[PDB]
Design a protein around this ligand. Structure first.
Ligand SMILES: O=C(Nc1cccc(Oc2ccc(Nc3ncnc4ccn(CCOCCO)c34)cc2Cl)c1)NC1CCCCC1
Length: 307
């Protein structure tokens, strides 16, 4: 019944690799809770750096807060396994990361989807601010697609305890290692900019070492071709030097929700009205994650977790 489930090595299996980078490797696999006779599709993140049994209580305390998050726009930590390594277990998000998604589907993404994703991300970020949890690493690479209609924030927590994403960071975080919910708003603006450019790399060609001086001179990310000046001004406001003058996530939810009621007024996308995204049944990203032989008689995590 534990909110943070403590999993034995025997209670999960890594089936295939999903991704690999800085902090470690993510696998698609199955959660098979002991004696419960049920198989749950999960992702498994195994951290690169070794762990000691001493820091374990500090990791568990941090992990408890991550396991406590319950919002439809935030991924919940389902379980943890601490041995020589730290392994984290979460619900498999069967469409992958949003950064990749928008790059892939740039020809079938309408203004309605883009604006709805902005709303969902702000709602998730507002929920973390209610839990007094600064994300520190919001970016489109850390948002996951549950269905084309529904995205979720991931990769928050353990950050201060365990490469620097300079181009997403607020100026005060770069200069003084100040992180707050208002620095998260700055990263949210870069995130929205990534979505609206269908996954462009921010400040392409500018080296990370020069970013602080460019921001001090007043330079910012340019207006995405699809964005009206109403939408671009929201982004610009997220990057004000004065962190207290930036929008709050609560205010962002309101503004983007208004835009989402009349989407073609705020984004100009050629052929907008005719754009459709492949369903779970019609998707080959989805069917590639799920048509494996070992992904046979499974139960979705949201279902299993009905108390
Ligand atoms: O890790 C966290 N916190 C944290 C917070 C919550 C959960 C959580 O667990 C996971 C997070 C992400 C993923 N990945 C995926 N999950 C689901 N479906 C897919 C599909 C493709 N992927 C792969 C692409 O994922 C993109 C996101 O990386 C997926 C896997 C797990 Cl288990 C870790 N903080 C770190 C802070 C810095 C130091 C190290 C800890």
């Amino acid at each position: 019944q534990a909110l943070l489930r403590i999993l034995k090595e025997t209670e999960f299996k890594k089936i295939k690799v999903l991704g690999s980078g800085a902090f470690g490797t993510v696998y698609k696999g199955l959660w098979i809770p002991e004696g419960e006779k049920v198989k749950i599709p999960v992702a498994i993140k195994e951290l690169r750096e070794a762990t000691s049994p001493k820091a374990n209580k500090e990791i568990l305390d941090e992990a408890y807060v991550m396991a406590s998050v319950d919002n439809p726009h935030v991924c919940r930590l389902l379980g943890i396994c601490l041995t020589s390594t730290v392994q984290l277990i979460t619900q498999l998000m069967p469409f992958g990361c949003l950064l990749d998604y928008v790059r892939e589907h740039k020809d079938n993404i309408g203004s309605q989807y883009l604006l709805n994703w902005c709303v969902q991300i702000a709602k998730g970020m507002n929920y973390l601010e209610d839990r007094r949890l600064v994300h520190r690493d919001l970016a489109a690479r850390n948002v996951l697609v549950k269905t084309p209609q529904h995205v979720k924030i991931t990769d928050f927590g353990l950050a201060k305890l365990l490469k620097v994403p300079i181009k997403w960071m607020a100026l005060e975080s770069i200069l003084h290692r100040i992180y707050t919910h208002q620095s998260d708003v700055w990263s949210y603006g870069v995130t929205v900019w990534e979505l609206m450019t269908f996954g462009s790399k921010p400040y392409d060609g500018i080296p990370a070492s020069e970013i602080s001086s460019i921001l001090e001179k007043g330079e910012r990310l340019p207006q995405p071709p699809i964005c009206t000046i109403d939408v671009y001004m929201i982004m610009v406001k997220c990057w004000m030097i004065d962190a207290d003058s930036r929008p709050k996530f609560r205010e962002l939810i309101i503004e983007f929700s208004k835009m989402a009621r009349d989407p073609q007024r705020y984004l100009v996308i050629q052929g907008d009205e005719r754009m459709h995204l492949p369903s779970p049944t019609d998707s080959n990203f989805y069917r590639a994650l799920m048509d494996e032989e070992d992904m046979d008689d499974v139960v979705d995590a949201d279902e299993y977790l009905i108390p």
